[PDB]
């Protein structure tokens, strides 16, 4: 009775069609949902925005177990596919937007799961034009501002700060070496 293509499988499929076909990554990047298209959609938002906000973050109640690993694979593929700047720029802009959105978010385990998952996607992407874009967009400075947008007493705060330090170390090294 379970669906045979869970969103995990659909993500792996899209990751493959991105990795093979040039235009698919740009079409997925520009495609955006519409109001009242699904229960999880509140207003017009990009597919990358939905993958970053609702599918990528670990959440304690399953719908599919391995949705986050495969949304991470999907966004990794959408980066690695060179696709000039059409796919990578919209990916980076949307990751920056989802970071700023989650930092403005109210203090919640939803906030820390979103933040940690965005740090994980920046770290996987980071593992060179993506780094050029991260510099140009000031993503490193928005990572460094992360604690400004925390309550420094939260029991999650150290884990989300660790997560934000993880791409900062790699990026600072790659720049200043």
């Amino acid at each position: 009775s379970k669906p045979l293509m869970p969103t995990s499988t659909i993500l792996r499929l899209l990751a493959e069609l991105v990795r093979s076909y040039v235009g698919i990554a740009t079409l997925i990047a520009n495609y955006s949902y519409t109001v009242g298209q699904s229960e999880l959609i509140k207003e017009d938002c990009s597919v990358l925005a939905f993958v970053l906000d609702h599918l990528l973050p670990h959440t304690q109640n399953a719908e599919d177990k391995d949705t986050p690993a495969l949304a991470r694979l999907f966004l990794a593929s959408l980066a690695a596919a060179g696709s000039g700047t059409d796919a990578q720029v919209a990916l980076v802009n949307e990751v920056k937007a989802a970071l700023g959105r989650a930092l403005a978010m109210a203090e919640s385990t939803e906030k820390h799961a979103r933040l940690q998952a965005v740090m994980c996607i920046i770290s996987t992407i980071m593992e060179n034009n993506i780094i050029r874009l991260f510099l140009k967009k000031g993503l490193v400075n928005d990572l460094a501002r992360v604690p400004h947008s925390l309550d420094l007493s939260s029991p999650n705060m150290a884990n989300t700060v660790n997560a934000a330090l993880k791409p900062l170390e790699t990026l600072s090294r790659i720049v200043n070496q």
């Binding site: 009775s1 379970k2 669906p3 045979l4 293509m5 499988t9 659909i10 499929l13 493959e16 069609l17 093979s20 076909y21 040039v22 235009g23 698919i24």
Partner: protein, 1429 residues
Amino acid sequence: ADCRALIDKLKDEQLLLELQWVDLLDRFDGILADAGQQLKMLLLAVLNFTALLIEYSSIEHLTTLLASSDMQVVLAVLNLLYVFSKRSNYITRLGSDKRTPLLTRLQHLAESWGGKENGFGLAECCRDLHMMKYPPSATTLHFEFYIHIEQLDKISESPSEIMESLTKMYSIPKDKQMLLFTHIRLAHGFSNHRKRLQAVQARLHAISILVYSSILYNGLIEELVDVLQITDKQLMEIKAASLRTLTSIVHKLSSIIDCTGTASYHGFLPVLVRNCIQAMIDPSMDPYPHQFATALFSFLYHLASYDAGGEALVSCGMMEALLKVIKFLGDEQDQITFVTRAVRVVDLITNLDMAAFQSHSGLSIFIYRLEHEVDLCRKECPFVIKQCIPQRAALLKSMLNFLKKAIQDPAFSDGIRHVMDGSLPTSLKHIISNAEYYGPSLFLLATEVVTVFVFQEPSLLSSLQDNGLTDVMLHALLIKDVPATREVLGSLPNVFSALCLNARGLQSFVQCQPFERLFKVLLSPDYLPAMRRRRSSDPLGDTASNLGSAVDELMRHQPTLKTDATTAIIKLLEEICNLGRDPKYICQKIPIPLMDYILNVMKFVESILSNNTTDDHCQEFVNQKGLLPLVTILGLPNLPIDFPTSAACQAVAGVCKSILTLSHEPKVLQEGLLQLDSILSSLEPLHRPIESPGGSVLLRELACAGNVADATLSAQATPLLHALTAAHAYIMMFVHTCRVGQSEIRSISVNQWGSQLGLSVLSKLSQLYCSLVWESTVLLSLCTPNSLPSGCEFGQADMQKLVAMAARIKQIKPLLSASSRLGRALAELFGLLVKLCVGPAARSTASALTKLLTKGLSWQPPPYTPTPRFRLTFFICSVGFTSPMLFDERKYPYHLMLQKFLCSGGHNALFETFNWALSMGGKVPVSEGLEHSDLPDGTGEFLDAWLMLVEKMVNPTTVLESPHSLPAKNFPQFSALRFLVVTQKAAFTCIKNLWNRKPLKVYGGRMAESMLAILCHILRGEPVIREREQDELHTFTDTMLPGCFHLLDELPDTVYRVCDLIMTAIKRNGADYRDMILKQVVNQVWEAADVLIKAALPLTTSDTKTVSEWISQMATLPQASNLATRILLLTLLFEELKLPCAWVVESSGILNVLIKLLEVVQPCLQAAKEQKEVQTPKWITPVLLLIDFYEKTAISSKRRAQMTKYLQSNSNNWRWFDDRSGRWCSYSASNNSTIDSAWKSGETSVRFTAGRRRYTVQFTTMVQVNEETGNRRPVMLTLLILIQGLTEDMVTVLIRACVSMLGVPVDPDTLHATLRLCLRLTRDHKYAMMFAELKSTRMILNLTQSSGFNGFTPLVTLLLRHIIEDPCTLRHTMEKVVRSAATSGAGSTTSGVVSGSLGSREINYILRVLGPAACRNPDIFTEVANCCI
């Protein structure tokens, strides 16, 4: 014991606990579950005592008891949890159901107060300080999650009601109010000394538990050492807590050492220790509390156990003070315990320095203390060859362990001679002489101290003999009863290895008949608990095996003992025979544990005989006539019925096998055969039937046994059942000795079985086999509830004596198992004997075994039988028995056995059993039998077994090619060819008699499949055997199709064997016969399809229901049962006959009919989906697979045709790729011609030899494999009936039908076939667009897991890629692939070296790697490769 007396006394309870397991712990857990919800003091006493019981279900209560206002109970709970975590990992292994609530309460107790740096040092918490020198935040709460209270005194009452009032006044986070409660009760405490000390002590306990299982900080060690320095002396419980904490912290050690000062003689810890010791020694100076002193000596023990601490204890010279303790301390139980602690510390310290110990005469001090303690035991137990207080026994034990260690240590090798001229031997003499007052492990330590000394100085064994310590050991280990434990038994032979070492010692040892006494251990129930396997995971008899290997080492050191050892072994065996022979004993699972004796003795003898593998023990044992007592143990009357399957019988068999394989001696088999012949001669009354209407002899011997409650337990009550279970044990020994791979042992086995006695036994075993099949089938016929018999008194007369049904069944079941297990062991024996016989006397062994096969196949019951089923069930197991004996695993025959099975008989009897089974004894002809209504119930099961045997008997590819062929040469030479002539001729007639009749209710599809396999083998074989009656097989292949299609209507699963039969009839006959077959199959499909096309015309007039009838009519009409096999047959035929069957499927137009049927069923399936009761017509998948392979075949034929257009048909040059040079090197002309001819024939692989190396080519992969090395190398062919395929108007209709079958989720296997077809069709983007324009990706996303299959996600991904790959995107991706393959030296499964620069880069190889891309689109692949290469 006294524990039980204390339990009875307690069960004023609290007064008794104040004076001082399951139901006492349960009453405790009761009151624990009661108090936590004249009470508290009961809880406290329960806890304070339990903290002793655990030190030699409560947890969930204890965790709640930590929520106490009176810290006394918190402390007692903590002391118990420390005793736990110290001793065993009981709270570490626990689950997080309560482990986390526990560890968190402990953390909240333990967590820091700010230390010295904030004015909360533990020293200051223990000194009073006036309550005005502490930080003002001490009597203050500041709990946040926000609560702050400046001072607690104006509300000092009821801290628990403070916490509950804060629960009501504020919402305290749920399940974490404990950190509030502990802060609040602390802030109440800190006002006063006792409560502050109790908080300090609870914190120290909590630390220690958290370390035995963030809390620790730089000042903690210094604080603890300053608590220890505090000299008000009212703190000794806080000092002991601080030492126990330092102990937990040892597991920073350099800081502990720097603070305590252990690195120097003057220093706080050493001085404290010396003051404790001096107060313990001298009576005037008051003694430091027992608890504190114990914490000091435990800290010293744990510190010494680490190298930094042992080096510090060296540096401060604690060995002098501890030797002072061990010299001057008194005799009272507490002082003894401090002495043993000092001894264990002097042990740890001496594991790294000896010089201090030696300079302080520590060995003399130890020996004097051992003399003093033995002298204090001497009063209780003065006996010496001419209960010990536990603490003194532990002292002696640790001190003897020290002496053993010192003897095994250099720095005493100069001087250890002067240990045994002290008093020591006079005190060991007392431990050894009183192994019942002193424990057995202490008696062991004493004998091991002597053994280790004698191995350090074998010279002074003369001194130990002169003072008679060895003569006391002998008396204590032989003449006096040995203490019954594993370690003592394991050591006796090593002790004797020492005591023999002087030759005089050997004389004295052999003087006292040592092995008659030492081996009695194996026949004594007193030592069976020592012999029982430990941990339940070491082998059966592991300890007797160790003892035996140690006696082997002993008497290989001292060969003079070998003859007496084997004499006492043989006396063990003769006594086991005595205990098994006479009636008065009865084996327990008077009761006697005989089977345990037999396992332990046999593991002992096995170890001895097989340890060195020098055949000196085997020879001695066999020459002293021990094989008779050994082999007799199998036949023992009072051994149980379940003996032969037991590990004791496998042990006796293993000892026989060890003797056989070591000594190469026939005598084990000769004696086994003599005794087996003796037992077989006893049970001839089993062979003679009732000779009246009667049942089983075993049940007439049982039933006539009066009314004895258990006859089967008596060897006189059931002589034949006990001779059965003796023969079974012998047969399991012959099995074990046949399971041997030494060709010499095989040869002497065969020479024995070929003897006059061997064949007398083998004849009697054959008659026994037929008797046991009879008796077992009669007995099961009697345990059946009056169903198998025909309402007759066949065995009832004896069941009326035996006896409401179970009361009779449960008396027969021991008979049935004793006879069925023996039959299976006989069958195993005869199979092994066949294996040994095949690989002169072997020929007589095989003769007797094929006479057994003949006897079993021609056996006829006595004429009082109530039903033929007893013969059919005899025949089924005779056939299932003859199969293992004529044919190996892998189904190759033994030609010796087929020769003797033919000449002697059993082939004419094999086929007579078929005639008998069908004709029912001539009552009905064979041609009418199968279809006769009154055919016996088991005639399908017999025919299944008979056909499965004959399928093996007829196959030429094994009967001619069998590895087990006879050599080429007075005797009649065998021909497997004439054997197959007579066998195929005999089989064909019986199959005739089954060819067309309707199948049996059960065992009809296995019958059909083995009958078809026989026909296939015959039809393939006559071409090969006429090489070295044909018209009968001709007329058969003419008329066989009516029967083939009858089989396809009755038993669809046979269709694969009907395909194979048709293919063999085709390869016999011409294309004129291939055409007739294919056109007839296609006409059957045609009518079955056109009736279903007429079955689905829309139901306008409503005469039929038009919903349930129409939807299920498409699926259930007989025609819809036919198509599922007529199409599938046509498809298998197509797969073999690729192009003829394609051309017929084209020219018949049947494909249009199948497309029309797939279209017309869609309304029906859709309406079924709307009933929500879809039930897919199974015939749909054959149609999709047929279309799939029709268009697969057409693709391929066009490609092969245009390949032929570019090749010269003569000497097509095949070339093999040399990756190292990058050359397509040619084959020899004969190899090239062979490979070309076999490729053109369409064979998948071709074998050839070059340079005498064996090469094989695989045209699936186009690879030459070198057969010796497995190196795989690429090959190529050097280039210089037109099947139209599916038309557009067919493909368009198929795509719509496949989308509709995805819409309605028809079935998993049907979705797999329809998606496979879509995958083939959509490789043209026009049809991929059609498949995507019909909204199939929504259906595919909607599909549920009920409609999924292994390949679903790969296949769907390929389909979506087929939709995505439009001409341009495919071009760009093919460019990417071509560039990638040319730029990267890709590896392969053809040993093309990874990142190679010759082989990885040739155009002719790269085009082979890119072949999948050429198939994806050859035109685009040309354009791309021209532009990018």
